[PDB]
Design a protein around this ligand. Structure first.
Ligand SMILES: CCCCCCCCCCCCCCCCCC(=O)OC[C@H](COP(=O)([O-])OCC(O)COP(=O)([O-])OC[C@@H](COC(=O)CCCCCCCCCCCCCCCCC)OC(=O)CCCCCCCCCCCCCCCCC)OC(=O)CCCCCCCCCCCCCCCCC
Ligand SMILES: CCCCCCCCCCCCCCCCCC(=O)OC[C@H](COP(=O)([O-])OCC(O)COP(=O)([O-])OC[C@@H](COC(=O)CCCCCCCCCCCCCCCCC)OC(=O)CCCCCCCCCCCCCCCCC)OC(=O)CCCCCCCCCCCCCCCCC
Ligand SMILES: CCCCCCCCCCCCCCCCCC(=O)OC[C@H](COP(=O)([O-])OCC(O)COP(=O)([O-])OC[C@@H](COC(=O)CCCCCCCCCCCCCCCCC)OC(=O)CCCCCCCCCCCCCCCCC)OC(=O)CCCCCCCCCCCCCCCCC
Ligand SMILES: CCCCCCCCCCCCCCCCCC(=O)OC[C@H](COP(=O)([O-])OCC(O)COP(=O)([O-])OC[C@@H](COC(=O)CCCCCCCCCCCCCCCCC)OC(=O)CCCCCCCCCCCCCCCCC)OC(=O)CCCCCCCCCCCCCCCCC
Ligand code: HEA
Ligand code: HEA
Ligand SMILES: CCCCCCCC/C=C\CCCCCCCC(=O)OC[C@H](COP(=O)(O)OCCN)OC(=O)CCCCCCC/C=C/CCCCCCCC
Ligand SMILES: CCCCCCCC/C=C\CCCCCCCC(=O)O[C@H](COC(=O)CCCCCCC/C=C/CCCCCCCC)COP(=O)(O)OCCN
Ligand SMILES: [O-][O-]
Ligand SMILES: [Cu+2]
Ligand SMILES: [K+]
Ligand SMILES: [Zn+2]
Lengths: 93, 141, 226, 107, 61, 76, 459, 65, 103, 62
């Protein structure tokens, strides 16, 4: 609902027009096993699984890419150097 | 005003030392009992006598400072207050206008003159054979 | 007070979602057994039921009217306790200035514990001396060694508890006749008909009495997504 | 500058001819290092220390009023040694003025 | 909404309002204490060696 | 204007000009790239990078003509 | 916990504990000096290792000022009693208070580690360039310590200034001393940081501020612009302690409270605009020298008022009260000692007299009487006054007339001869000297070894 | 709790373990060594002797010892 | 809500603790070393601190020693130059393509 | 503020006292030694105990 200071101009409650069965939380009461939150439906906690998974992937990609550059490409002053820092093609040293 | 001051510009809590002038003195008045007439000797002290909420005016000041925080509509200030609230903003905007429409034209003119005559139009021409633009702010020479 | 922050939204009213869902038991609970949220809604439901019944107000005595709204009638004992509470609260962030203390009228030093640190600055003008700090403990009439000002400690204590607004209410307010749920229903039908709900607390309260989600639109009102 | 409280002549007149200044000793007694008992554990030694505070002592006058331990600064008002949380209740600095309001009195 | 159910505000320090998350963050940095000591000790060795301070006796032997 | 800044006369090394007590290495304490060049002396670094490239050590920059790159602000 | 504690009173103890620990290294460095100066010729430092002596004097000066006395007087006692003298419960910024003491320790570890690992060379505690910028990496390490120490000082100054917002009582004289010291730090520290960065720029970034066509005297102005306020930042907290001790132990209201407060304020204002009396011999303009000399003498006027106000506090106190307490003796000793140090300061304020006495041991004795005796004794006196509140034990210092007498006699033996040596003349920052100055240097050396022995008796 | 009333209650109530004091004194002792040990090390490094003999850098009589 | 007795009788009969015995000025010279070498909690902490400080010192030590030797041998471009010169001698060519590039 | 940190709380009672098997009260470490020597002097000093009081502080040789 939100704050108590926001209200409809005309206070009207809709007469239920559908026959949909009431959701369980709409009729739930406080219980000893659920002292709080009984009015809200249960939801999956994706953050507990996605955060550590995504972090590991990024670290693996970050480290693996860094290792590959320093091994496959020739020695250079910086990463950009090792990619584009070579002499022009056909320039013998 | 931008800066917060406990005494005058107290927007964090909204506390005001005195009530609004709208209220009649009978309804509410500033907390001033300096003019209280001498107490008769036969009167006896019941309360603490300590400055605080036992005094009616202070109690009403505390009550109003809490209950004024909800009001149906805005208490519109006059244009003088509104001007003062954004005095810096308006003045900085006019300063930007001055830079574009006053400084810009004559600065452009000076550079064009400098191109042709080797020195800005507001500088004495040299006869010493040194090359280059030279100074810009002539009065600081 | 000056040292309090801005009023919160809850300082004015509570959201209806905080109404206890077991209204039938709420209106039968003694005042001493009601918590802060339970007491708030007991007074609001019972108070607004009497105020939204205009035809009965003129015949209702001020004692009964005050009881229905949950307002405490003032008496010298309750007034004394409340007055010292506000004085203690005011002194939390305000200066301590008053008349010179004497044996007949000692300086009152409110405290919750058995001790509070106090300073004596003497009289006015030339009689004012340097601050002399001392520990004001209960049960002694303290006398400044320099100006001979008399101090005394006043303790906000009552039956293993310290004075509070709720404590004063419980000690002195007496529960009246048990609230009748018929009045709730009668006033509910007065101001709530054919989809118009001008008495919304009663509409929710009546719905809880009938269980939950019985009245029109209440199932949709109680269904939330998160 | 401060030169003591002002005194009027009438205030010096005694009600008896044998009145002399009271000879009450303001030496609180003989003290030394606080001596704990080996049997007392940490909690009970704390109680012992709290019962040896000089700033909780006073001298009772002949009229029942007491002149307490007093100090120029509040540093001498906390328990010795200083506890973790000292001023739970704000110390009150008492000022005096001649202003008064009618609500405080009753006729 | 009940005022007496928020006592964790003053019973618990703000740095640990987050429960296990705040404690875990504190515990993680604790694990780095000895790795830091080895790292810091190496820097002292690096400077000590580069200044030829290990050859104090070999210099005059 | 900066993209086509006119060249200026090479500075004559005066009495107190170009004084050095030690090489420039604060940018690269361990690598010590371009120890003789100043931190933003591009022309000196270009010739220094060329030496490193001629020594089989890659370095990034100073290889594309300014008029053949985007955002140069030097095109006719 | 021990490191996580935010309690200001605990942190105050940590400041006192850390200052004593660092004090041992400072005392060791001081002891190395007087042993070497016992007679002409090398005694404990090889001629081929003269660089070490320059490091000893450089660290002795730095550690004692920034790591020992300043934390003790500005960090230790204030963090313990200042929130108590105010009616408030704890310090305004608790977390900042914790990090400040930790910062001081880390900077100390960096400094001492640099002794062990880096080559040992010295440039004086004033770090005058170009000598400071042509040295080895130990100078770089010392700069990091000072900058790090500067961070702790400024944040601690911010902490004390916030007491004005929350103070629920009267601003006592002691509180004023800390507040004004904080003001001096706020205005002087940023100037110090700026010039120190320039020293780093020359050392580490190939800057040329301190080579030909760059005025080296530029450093002296900016450094001493902070340098002299620093000495006044050290002493002002000591003045606050003396005011409390004298009033409390004599049961006498502080006389001329407002005069005392205004004297502290006046000293800070004057102390911020007299820095160039450290630069008399560099060849400043005639009018410039006259200005600084004239304003430097004016600092005695407010400082004199405080001295006299202190004297009347002790005069007339009850005879029945025992006057042999160590705290009272130290407070009285401070007045006697400070007058000696201040008077010699006025003598060397006259620039023509200073021409002969600059960079001589007369200047050493001048600031030792004020700092090594006066400030230390004030810090000792304050700690002794708060012994019951602090609660430390296992020492015999509260009633020990032998310690007070022996300390006073022996410290005077160390530094009185150094005044005489100044006219002889012996330069400062010197390891060898002519054979005809041995007698006075020998007497001071005997004084130094004696003082160290006395410290062992307190335990 | 009564045990938590006083800061550093064990020390103030005179029950603390003496090891805490020993560490404090040891820490101070180690701080002092930072002035003496590098002196000895530096002397040997530049001279080959831990400490000089008094006036060994000046001309000495034949019988001097 | 917890219920506790006014007192408890311990199972053992040893008076382990009490007033500290009178000591001299140099009592610490033997008592302190005794604690270090005789108290379990003392030398266990010392060994724990020494072992782990040294444990993490090794990997840092190995890395720096290799790095330090490499740096003394020359700059990065000097190391590549020597390989380039070795490659030229192997092929006998005066000029050869750079690493990662073909003829 | 309801529910905030109380301005005053009473100390809970101390933990139960400990007795040995034979009934002797258990002692705890106490750093107040009784030094052994032949000196028995007692020095007393009138000490400031605030502004209006004193205390006769004694130092005992033992
Ligand atoms: C079509 C689509 C196509 C898509 C394509 C997508 C492609 C994606 C590719 C992704 C992969 C990228 C890989 C490269 C990443 C960069 C890595 C790197 O080099 O960074 C540093 C790099 C320079 O390094 P470098 O020269 O390349 O490397 C030299 C080597 O390090 C040489 O080594 P060295 O020995 O000289 O170095 C000294 C050594 C020093 O080493 C030592 O001192 C230690 C040695 C012994 C240790 C042994 C163990 C003992 C115990 C040690 C304890 C230590 C701690 C102690 C306590 C504290 C004190 C130390 O230093 C290190 O070891 C360095 C690392 C240290 C650790 C730092 C922390 C890293 C953590 C990362 C992960 C997070 C945590 C994971 C936790 C996991 C938990 C499950 O610097 C910069 O990057 C500077 C520029 C700033 C960033 C610029 C970003 C630009 C982004 C461009 C975006 C383009 C967008 C285009 C859009 C176009 C749209 C059209
Ligand atoms: C030639 C062409 C080129 C020209 C170039 C010019 C370059 C100027 C560079 C300036 C850089 C920017 C600085 C300001 C940035 C913020 C601007 C801003 O927001 O303005 C609008 C805004 C207007 O406020 P408002 O409330 O809307 O006012 C409405 C109306 O204007 C009516 O307002 P109202 O009159 O009703 O009063 C309300 C308002 C009025 O205040 C303002 O509005 C302030 C406006 C200042 C603007 C800047 C003008 C230049 C100031 C020069 C000051 C020189 C100090 C002395 C130096 C001596 C050197 C030897 O009050 C406050 O806001 C209070 C602020 C807190 C003040 C704290 C002062 C601490 C220092 C006190 C003196 C210490 C020395 C004592 C010596 C004696 C000892 C016995 O200003 C603020 O709110 C700013 C306040 C926060 C920043 C304060 C910074 C204080 C710094 C203190 C330094 C102390 C150093 C001491 C040692 C020095 C020697 C060693
Ligand atoms: C037969 C021969 C005949 C020969 C005939 C010859 C004829 C000769 C004619 C000569 C005429 C001379 C006239 C003299 C009398 C003048 C009388 C007069 O009106 O005086 C007052 C008049 C104005 O004063 P006023 O009455 O006080 O102003 C009224 C205000 O409204 C007061 O109200 P307010 O205080 O409320 O004002 C607003 C205020 C309200 O304040 C607030 O809201 C509160 C907060 C204030 C503090 C602000 C803190 C900082 C704010 C941060 C924001 C910054 C934004 C910009 C950021 C920029 C980033 C790059 O806020 C501001 O104003 C400040 C904020 C606005 C933006 C600030 C921008 C930065 C300013 C600082 C830098 C300035 C230098 C820039 C240089 C260029 C760029 C580098 O003064 C002048 O105009 C100055 C006199 C100039 C004399 C020049 C004489 C030499 C030139 C002679 C030329 C002709 C010679 C030709 C040859 C002849 C040969 C024969
Ligand atoms: C200027 C001087 C003259 C001043 C005169 C004026 C003085 C006036 C009075 C001033 C009073 C100020 C206020 C005082 C308030 C005191 C409050 C208090 O007591 O608080 C309680 C506080 C703690 O008591 P608590 O509450 O029971 O704490 C329980 C613990 O938290 C928990 O218990 P726990 O057992 O679990 O504890 C953990 C324990 C765990 O314990 C153990 O495991 C111990 C194991 C035994 C280790 C023993 C050391 C072994 C050393 C071996 C060395 C081998 C060398 C081989 C050489 C070979 C050469 C060939 O420790 C640790 O785990 C960490 C220890 C870290 C700190 C110690 C660091 C030591 C130095 C390390 C140096 C490293 C150098 C590396 C350099 C490398 C460079 C590359 O007390 C202390 O901390 C002791 C304070 C003692 C002084 C009190 C004041 C007395 C009056 C002053 C006396 C004079 C002092 C003179 C200075 C010292 C001279 C040397
Ligand atoms: C706490 C430290 C401290 C304090 C308080 C002072 C206080 C003063 N100092 Fe000091 N000073 C130092 C620390 C201190 N100084 C240090 C460390 C150096 C050397 C830095 C270095 O080179 O490394 C130094 C150096 C120094 C120099 C020489 C700088 C140089 O060329 O090298 C001078 C010159 O005038 C000086 C003057 C003064 C004066 C005039 C005061 C005044 O505040 C003293 C005023 C006090 C009195 C005068 C006594 C009390 C008053 C009266 C008894 C009555 C009135 C008296 C008269 C009117 C004469 N000081
Ligand atoms: C606070 C600062 C301080 C303190 C205490 C001291 C104390 C002492 N100092 Fe000094 N000294 C300086 C600051 C200090 N010094 C400075 C800034 C220089 C100039 C540096 C330079 O040349 O660049 C200097 C220079 C200096 C020199 C000149 C070096 C040279 O030019 O060659 C000498 C020579 O003997 C010397 C000796 C001493 C002696 C013998 C003591 C002491 O032994 C005197 C007696 C003191 C004790 C016996 C110890 C007492 C205990 C404490 C001081 C710690 C107390 C701690 C707490 C209470 C927490 N000092
Ligand atoms: C994802 C990547 C994002 C990157 C981009 C966004 C982030 C940018 C962050 C801010 C960058 C600010 C850089 C500030 C330093 C600029 C350096 C610079 O320009 O210096 C050169 C400039 C002028 O030099 P010349 O070349 O001679 O000019 C001639 C003109 N042709 O000034 C200088 O030389 C002075 C250099 C001062 C550098 C100070 C920067 C701090 C460096 C600290 C190093 C400390 C190392 C020691 C160990 C401690 C480590 C903390
Ligand atoms: C929005 C806030 C802005 C605040 C800005 C504040 C700016 C100032 C901050 C402090 C720095 C002051 C500038 C430094 C001045 C140095 C001048 C100097 O060294 O010059 C002397 C000469 O200087 C003098 O004569 C000394 C004058 C003293 C200047 C002091 C200025 C700063 C004073 C700050 C004190 C604190 C504030 C007091 C406020 C009022 C108190 C009532 C050198 O002379 P010679 O080498 O012989 O050369 C002469 C020609 N060859
Ligand atoms: O510095 O005096
Ligand atoms: Cu100075
Ligand atoms: K010598
Ligand atoms: Zn009084």
């Amino acid at each position: 609902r939100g704050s108590v200071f926001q209200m409809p101009s005309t206070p009207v409650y809709p007469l239920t027009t559908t026959k949909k069965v009431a959701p369980p939380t709409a009729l739930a009461k406080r219980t000893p096993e659920q002292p709080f939150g009984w009015g809200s439906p249960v939801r999956e906690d994706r953050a507990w699984r996605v955060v550590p998974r995504n972090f590991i992937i990024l670290v693996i990609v970050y480290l693996s890419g860094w290792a590959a550059i320093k091994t496959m490409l020739p020695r250079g002053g910086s990463i950009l150097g090792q990619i584009y820092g070579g002499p022009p093609k056909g320039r013998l040293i | 005003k931008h800066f917060f001051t406990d005494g005058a510009n107290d927007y964090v809590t909204g506390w005001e030392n005195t009530p609004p002038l709208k209220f009649p003195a009978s309804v509410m008045k500033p907390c001033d009992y300096s003019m209280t007439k001498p107490i008769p000797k036969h009167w006896k002290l019941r309360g603490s006598g300590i400055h605080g909420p036992e005094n009616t005016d202070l109690m009403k000041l505390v009550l109003w400072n809490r209950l004024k925080q909800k009001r149906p509509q805005r208490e519109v200030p006059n244009i003088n207050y509104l001007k003062d609230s954004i005095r810096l903003e308006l003045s900085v905007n006019w300063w930007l206008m001055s830079c574009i429409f006053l400084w810009g034209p004559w600065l452009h003119w000076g550079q064009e003159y400098q191109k042709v005559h080797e020195q800005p139009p507001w500088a004495m021409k040299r006869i010493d054979g040194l090359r280059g633009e030279g100074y810009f702010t002539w009065f600081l020479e | 007070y000056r040292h309090w922050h801005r009023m919160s939204e809850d300082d004015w009213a509570l959201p209806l979602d905080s109404m206890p869902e077991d209204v039938k038991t709420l209106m039968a609970t003694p005042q001493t057994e009601r918590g802060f949220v339970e007491d708030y809604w007991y007074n609001r439901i019972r108070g607004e039921a009497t105020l939204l019944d205009p035809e009965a107000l003129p015949s209702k005595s001020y004692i009964a009217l005050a009881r229905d709204m949950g307002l405490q009638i003032v008496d010298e004992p309750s007034s004394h306790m409340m007055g010292l509470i506000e004085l203690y609260e005011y002194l939390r962030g305000a200066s301590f200035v008053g008349p010179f203390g004497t044996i007949e009228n000692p300086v009152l030093v409110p405290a919750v514990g058995q001790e509070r640190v106090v300073a004596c600055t003497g009289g006015v003008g030339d009689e004012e001396h340097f601050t002399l700090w001392f520990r004001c403990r209960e049960g002694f009439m303290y006398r400044c060694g320099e100006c001979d000002q008399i101090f005394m400690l006043v303790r906000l204590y009552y039956e293993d508890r310290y004075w509070t607004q709720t404590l004063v209410r419980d000690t002195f307010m007496s529960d009246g006749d048990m609230f009748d749920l018929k009045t709730l229903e009668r006033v509910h039908k007065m101001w709530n008909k054919d989809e118009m709900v001008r008495w919304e607390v009663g509409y929710w309260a009546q719905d809880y009495v009938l269980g939950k989600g019985v009245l029109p639109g209440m199932v949709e009102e109680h269904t939330r997504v998160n | 500058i401060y030169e003591g409280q002002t005194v009027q002549e009438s205030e010096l007149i005694p009600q008896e001819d044998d009145w002399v200044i009271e000879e009450t000793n303001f030496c609180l007694g003989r003290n030394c290092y606080v001596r704990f008992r080996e049997e007392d554990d940490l909690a009970r030694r704390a109680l012992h220390q709290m019962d040896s505070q000089l700033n909780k002592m006073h001298t009772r006058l002949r009229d029942g009023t007491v002149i307490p331990y007093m100090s120029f600064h509040p540093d001498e008002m906390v328990d010795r040694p200083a506890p973790i949380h000292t001023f739970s209740e704000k110390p009150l600095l008492k000022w005096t003025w001649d202003e008064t309001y009618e609500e405080a009195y009753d006729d | 909404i009940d005022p007496t159910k928020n006592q964790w505000r003053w019973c618990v320090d703000p740095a640990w309002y987050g429960g296990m998350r705040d404690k875990a963050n504190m515990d993680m940095y604790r694990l780095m204490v000895y790795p830091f000591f080895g790292y810091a000790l190496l820097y002292l060795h690096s400077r000590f060696k580069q200044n030829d301070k290990y050859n104090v006796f070999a210099k005059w032997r | 204007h900066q993209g086509t800044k006119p060249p200026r006369p090479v500075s004559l090394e005066s009495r107190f000009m170009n004084q050095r007590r030690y090489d420039f290495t604060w940018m690269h304490p361990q690598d010590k790239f371009c120890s003789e060049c100043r931190p933003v002396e591009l022309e000196c670094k270009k010739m220094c990078f060329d030496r490193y490239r001629s020594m089989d050590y890659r370095m990034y920059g100073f290889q594309r003509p300014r008029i053949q790159t985007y955002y140069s602000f030097s095109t006719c | 916990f021990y490191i996580l504690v935010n309690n200001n009173k605990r942190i105050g103890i940590y400041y006192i504990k850390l200052s004593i620990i660092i004090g041992i290294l400072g005392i060791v460095l001081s002891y190395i000096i007087r042993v070497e100066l016992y007679n002409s010729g090398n005694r404990i430092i090889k001629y081929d290792n003269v660089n070490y002596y320059n490091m000893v004097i450089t660290l002795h000066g730095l550690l004692m000022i920034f790591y020992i006395i300043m934390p003790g007087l500005y960090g230790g006692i204030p963090l313990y009693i200042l929130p108590i003298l105010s009616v408030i419960t704890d310090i305004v910024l608790p977390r900042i208070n914790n990090i400040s003491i930790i910062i001081v320790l880390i900077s100390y570890i960096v400094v001492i580690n640099s002794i062990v690992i880096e080559y040992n060379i010295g440039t004086g505690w004033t770090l005058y360039p170009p000598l400071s910028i042509i040295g080895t990496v130990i100078v770089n390490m010392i700069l990091y310590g000072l900058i790090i120490i500067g961070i702790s000082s400024i944040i601690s100054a911010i902490n004390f200034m916030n007491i004005l917002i929350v103070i629920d009582g009267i601003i006592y004289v002691y509180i004023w001393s800390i507040i004004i010291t904080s003001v001096l730090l706020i205005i002087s520290l940023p100037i110090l940081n700026g010039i120190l960065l320039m020293i780093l720029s020359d050392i580490y970034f190939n800057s040329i501020y301190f080579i030909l066509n760059g005025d080296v005297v530029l450093y002296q102005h900016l450094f001493w612009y902070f340098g002299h306020p620093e000495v006044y930042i050290l002493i002002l907290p000591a003045f606050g302690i003396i005011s409390i001790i004298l009033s409390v132990l004599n049961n006498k209201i502080i006389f001329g409270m407002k005069s005392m407060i205004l004297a502290i304020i006046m000293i800070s204002i004057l102390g911020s605009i007299v820095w160039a009396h450290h630069i008399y011999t560099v060849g400043l303009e005639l009018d410039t020298k006259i200005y600084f000399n004239n304003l430097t003498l004016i600092i005695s006027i407010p400082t004199g008022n405080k001295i006299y106000n202190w004297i009347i506090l002790y005069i007339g106190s009850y005879n029945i009260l025992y006057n042999g307490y160590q705290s009272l003796i130290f407070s009285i000793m401070f007045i006697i000692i400070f007058i000696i140090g201040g008077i010699t300061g006025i003598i060397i304020s006259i620039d023509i007299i200073d021409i002969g006495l600059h960079d001589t041991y007369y200047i050493v004795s001048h600031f030792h009487y004020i700092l090594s005796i006066g400030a230390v004794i004030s810090l000792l006196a304050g700690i002794l006054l708060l012994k019951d509140i602090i609660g430390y034990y296992n020492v015999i210092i509260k009633i020990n007339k032998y310690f007070g007498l022996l300390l006073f006699i022996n410290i005077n033996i160390i530094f009185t001869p150094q005044f005489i040596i100044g006219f002889n003349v012996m330069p400062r920052r010197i390891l060898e000297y002519s054979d005809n100055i041995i007698v006075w240097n020998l007497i001071s050396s005997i004084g130094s070894i004696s003082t160290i022995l006395i410290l062992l008796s307190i335990f | 709790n009564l045990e938590d009333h006083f800061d550093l209650a064990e020390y103030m109530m005179k029950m603390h373990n003496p090891m805490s004091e020993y560490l404090y004194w040891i820490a101070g002792f180690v701080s002092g060594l930072h002035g003496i040990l590098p002196l000895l090390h530096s002397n040997y490094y530049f001279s080959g002797m831990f400490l000089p003999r008094d006036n060994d850098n000046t001309q000495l009589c034949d019988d001097s010892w | 809500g917890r219920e506790l007795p006014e007192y408890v009788v311990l199972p053992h009969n040893q008076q382990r603790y009490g007033r500290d015995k009178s000591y001299s000025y140099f009592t610490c010279l033997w008592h302190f070393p005794k604690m270090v070498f005789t108290e379990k909690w003392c030398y266990t902490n010392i060994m724990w601190f020494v072992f782990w400080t040294g444990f993490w010192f090794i990997p840092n030590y190995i890395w720096w020693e290799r790095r330090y030797a490499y740096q003394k041998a020359g700059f990065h471009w000097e190391h590549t130059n020597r390989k380039l010169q070795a490659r030229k001698e192997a092929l006998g060519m005066d000029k050869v393509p750079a690493s990662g590039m073909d003829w | 503020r309801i529910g905030g940190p109380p301005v005053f709380m009473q100390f809970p009672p101390p933990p139960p006292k400990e007795y040995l098997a034979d009934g002797t009260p258990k002692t705890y470490p106490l750093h107040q030694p009784v030094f052994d020597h032949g000196y028995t002097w007692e020095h007393w000093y009138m000490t400031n105990a605030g502004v209006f009081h004193t205390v006769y502080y004694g130092e005992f040789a033992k």
